[PDB]
């Protein structure tokens, strides 16, 4: 409401709408041709496996010398090792060039991405810590040709584009500490550079949205951001807002977000490709403003949003909806209480046993909307949410939990996680055992399982499935990504690339 | 050591376990018409099947059928029971009336469940038996499913338990006098012979008995004596590494955990070699600790492997087997293992004891090293079973044991066995590269407890155990966390043995 | 629009505070013999001193002395009281008996304590006053110590509190009718004049009133009105930055904390410039939060302390140039409220990641100290911030000693000296910024508002947080006073703080 | 009791009794003279302040070259920066020498050591993480002349001498991962090298004792260790053991340790210097075997023990006793309970309100013993213990809390902390306010304060003072070092060097 808050929020919106990646992509031969051996700056990174680093091709790289060779002997698996090279030609004027070597492990379980982009990210992040002038371009030579996972890994790495440090609040929270990164693959990448940029951009935008505090990213600013992208890329945007949610029967999302300063919203984005589509897919994302899980609770909405943008920018031949379930879970006079009975959009009634379990209610309305109210009926519904603490206990910090009603779709999403690096793992799909945990005396169901130690991740997924439209007969993929959205440095931008890869193999 | 009255009681308990015979027998409709000539075994009869099965024309031809039973079939609810009286129906007891209880089994079954839904079968029969006046009757249980293994275990599990301390049963070696003899009547002669199904049911019930038993009756000593009793009776080998020998021979894990207790810790290994050439060499390792209300059923894993072993011997399955019971009493005392102890495990690796609550995995570490390094053979497959983590319930729930497995193939096979047997399982994340860092220790090779509890808890405990496998072992390792599936609100379920029996069948 | 009845009540409460006059006066034995000619003020008299002081020949010469009083002196316990009746002793109330209560003060006093032990003095007089008959009486309190400032504050603190809502006092603007007038009688004419000691005692008791008062009476609005009332009455300046102006003018800390409340947050700055050339330029900053374990009851302690210390300075015309900035905000649960994970742009320009909304006090103070050190007509030589800030304070320095986090040995020593002299004792906590700073690492903001590890000098770290928001224009001594526990005891507020400041100002 | 446990314990005892430091000390000129410019190995460390690193003297060091200069520019404050130097002469046969530069801050509060040995330790630790082979000697060039604090700082740093990793349990838990470190000061050190070695040795032994788990360091093995040092250095040792404690009236330590497998012990060591002593000092140390504080609970006993050893080895002119209060706090049939009333050795009775507060009881007997039962009466009593969680809340992780009955002794111990780097800070000394917290209905006192938020560190100190002998009229210094004894790598060996420096300035 105050003039100063509004100026700040508009500026934040614009920063998101206009966000451009700091990463570019090329290959060794094209690099020799365009830069003619002259390093982009006083810092260069070389990243690969023990074996890859020893390949004869490496000796032919423009920064190679006997010190770099020694760096390769001395570096530890999963570690870095830096050397100075005197009088190596570079576009900055630097008497020395720093070359940081990083060794990626080859060890990778059957549930992991063989290229180990998790370590790639860590290695580059460590290398960039030795940067003191930030307005430079750092050449990152990677010896893997797994272009999609490497792109997302590098996009994720280092200092984040969202920052409030050292006066950055006056610059719309755009960090001035980020380095431009030029990724140099060995071979011309199987996915074109402009496309990889789009992927990286989405990873970073997703990261931005999740890193952003709730006083900047609100249900209102998120909506404005979506609208900005809709006008810029020419897709459709529908907004069902505040008291319209109540009037139109969306009792779940309405009751959850009803007491807040900013009104709850169901924001649906529509993309129809030029051709005949390979699949019709609906994305549903949870975005709550309220355990330091709460910091990253936009993860799901941000993920589906950014996955959607990538699909539009790459013109993927998938017909897509993206429904953002946006609500501010506020303590107030008009707020939903324990013991409220809600009439969901699906027509089913929900006894609110516990107000802490709001996410699934909001998602219930979301998935019903996606499966019942759009101009098409999807073949696949993917819901993504930072939903349960149980997720971490079950599948851990690197693997999102999958609750899926069909072996085939589950396998495909697992495959995509392994290819993209945004790994997943299944949780028990057994509705006959989940259902009884929601018995209610007076409503069709409760919102919270009676016993917390009876497949917690699965049960939350089950709840959501009860609100799918009868008109939907396809594959439903529930993605609990409570933990994979973040690490000790903040948001990871997990989700979008998983989706992009999933879409590619339809 | 012990008072004369305690020792008499413990011997009698040992004998009750060693001599335990199942209350269940198995036949089929045609054999039943032949042997009983339409006369019911008693004043109660149970009919159990799916909505469709119950409506099959064969059902009308059953000896207890009448228009009231037909009405029962119309009125019964899915997953429920409905009982009717039939006047003057011939029966070997009594009995002016016969009670016929109809139970409807659902057909709904997810891809991770057993299609026959033996979970409901158990519940239905349990409910029906609640209307029994007199015990020491035989109740005919007519089942319409031909899934004989899962039904056998399901009926074995059901109803009143053979272990009891109620109404003076303590003076009868804790053998319940409230159990009914049950005669299961399949539609067709069973694909697995009756004597074999009895063996399976017996193991389910013995396992149940061992887990139901309180820790003042089932001790590291009485469990060992029970194993020895079975060894003498069925002719298999038994090795016992006991107390201070554990320390001298380098088993620092199990030694330090159980060292302060009244009864000494023990590593009890059983050996079975079949007559022929074996299809596989398998080693079973089971955790058996005496210490929220998970602790009541903390013998679940040791009991499971023990009873699975017994079934293999009784059925003469063509598998070469070891069964190592890791038995220790986790006691508070003067000589006890503390927080911050560093233990030298049998594997040679050192373990920093961050938390004494996480003892189960240490004990198992010694167990799996023993099995993979110290026996007359090297196993192709190691299966460890334990009631290990609360996380298991959160992850896979109350009906599915969590599987941490190092090989897709073995995992798929054990899942298949769970689905066939009814003792269902589900996988947890196998990703050692991410589990390992959770056990970083300043001074030892590893800690015994993960730094962060919310990073795949079931998996990490499994990982810990794998670090103690012998380098000689290059096969499939299956870790089974069955903390919750071993029990329900009625006590022990006897989960585990039948899973193993079915897994062994399809090797 | 509050209801008509609430507004009447609140105006009356404001007036009670603005017009508050102490119940204590001060004289000496010789001036007493001269004015009262041996006639006791009333049917109760108190005699308070050390084991040795009580036995001094001067004592026998006091007008209430008799052999029963002597026997009281023998029988009384250290730290205890012992009362005797004296029949027919002359007194102005026309009472058949006079009650004489003797109290023995210990001489034991550690190097970190006030040697006069005013803590016990307070307790002794409190006990004595429990035997009071009539409520309109003056009770002569004969003290055998000449430590006038600490004794003045000790007596001001003692007994029944001027704030009361018992027995219909709500209809009398919460002015207790159970308080006795107290006449303190020193052995020698006091080194500080009586009219000055009255001003001290008044500030102690006003501070006590402000802290005792519940949050439905003392609000950000009524506290501001009270300050304004004192400004019109004593002729000092008052600046008020209020509500949405706080946001517009960049005070993001105090604005975000108090933003969802019924009553708007306020930064209230008072200005006093003495007639002469000042010995020091000092800025006081005080935290005053209303929440919307039982530390919360007394959470105005810091704002009240600095406010009352300021008033004493104006009334005594101390030669110090003073600002007093009250950081007033209601921490309310609501639709428009600041959340966990918010990033705030402080007035200092530094950004703060709100890890925990419970740690609001330091944020509000951050804006306060920046305002004081950057936005005023002068730049202070010394900044003193006072707050009921951490539970850690009690664990570290205890119930009687406020924790000092100070950037300069000299200023610390002086404030300690003032505590020991005034009786409002302090003790230092670790000053080590190089070790405090890493506890506030934030991924996205300049700092968090809460230390990563609670067991790494908790009182110090909160102090450190506050220092990060000092203006670069400031190069002087900063004294952070964590008084979470010394502001109260089992009877309510203690009025701790003002007298400490007054004594600190005296020795500049 | 088993043969294998006893073999292991004897070997552990021996490892402690015979422990020799891995650190040696010299200076630049003596180094040029002995090594003639040839580095000790393939790794060299240079550590100093921003200003010190830029001094002209630095360019004259044998490893200097333009890459090292560039390292000096690029390094961050509190950080390290490593470069390879090709073909620099070194005694190992190494084609390259790694030179790691570390920048020490000059920022230091009035309560800190100006040389910032805390950062020195961290810098050297980081540098040694790049060591290829162990059993090399690493030259550590320091630009500070604060020899005592640098000595302890380097002693503390890197991989610890106690280890159970990778088969070290079969080598009496002597790590094989440690490097020999040669510290090279600019000027010949004001304290001789052999003396600095004794200091470093004590720091590391103390570290060893505290790192050691309770199944290795027991009341019995610690006693055997003390006895081993007594035979070797020729000082006296008195042991009051088990049921003798009860018979001789030590009811505190007896009742605490009475139920354990190993008997409680009061172990007193006696050292009398050749001359007339400058002071008579009694050390008392708490050593309990029993939430992540419990790991390092020998800290106090280990500290006084090792401080004592340094005094004997340096022949400091101080008459010393060192009383180790050793007890195993066990759950058992014969154990001390809540609500027990104990008759302390001092004659005062203690109501055991809470068994968790055992440390102070044990110390009460210790200080009475020291002040009443020895051949001399001390002028100063110093008790050291890992006593309260409150300590961390009050004075933090780097500063031990001092509860002292005399301004002069307090100031001197603070001065020693600042000089030695083993920093301290005072807690409130106010007995008139501590005493009432211990009111007991039936005993002279309770063992635990009624209110936990009334100067917790101070109150525990007060309790201990009540058991001082009336014969004693000197300075009492209580040192609560619950937190400074450890960091994320284990024990710090905090305490001994503080004492040594304190003794130097008497």
Residue numbers in the entry:
A (entry chain E), D (entry chain D): 5 to 294, 306 to 521
B (entry chain A): 4 to 294, 306 to 521
C (entry chain F): 4 to 295, 306 to 521
Paper text:
All attempts to cryoprotect the crystals prior to vitrification resulted in substantial loss of diffraction quality, and only the apo TbLAP-A crystals were successfully cryoprotected. The structures of LAP-As in their apo and holo forms and in complex with inhibitors are practically identical.
Leucine aminopeptidase (LAP) is found in all kingdoms of life and catalyzes the metal-dependent hydrolysis of the N-terminal amino acid residue of peptide or amino acyl substrates. We report here the X-ray structures of three kinetoplastid acidic LAPs (LAP-As from Trypanosoma brucei, Trypanosoma cruzi, and Leishmania major) which were solved in the metal-free and unliganded forms, as well as in a number of ligand complexes, providing insight into ligand binding, metal ion requirements, and oligomeric state. LAPs of the M17 family of aminopeptidases are bilobal proteins with a highly conserved C-terminal domain harboring the aminopeptidase activity. They form homohexamers of approximately 330 kDa with the active sites facing a central cavity separated from the bulk solvent but accessible through solvent channels.
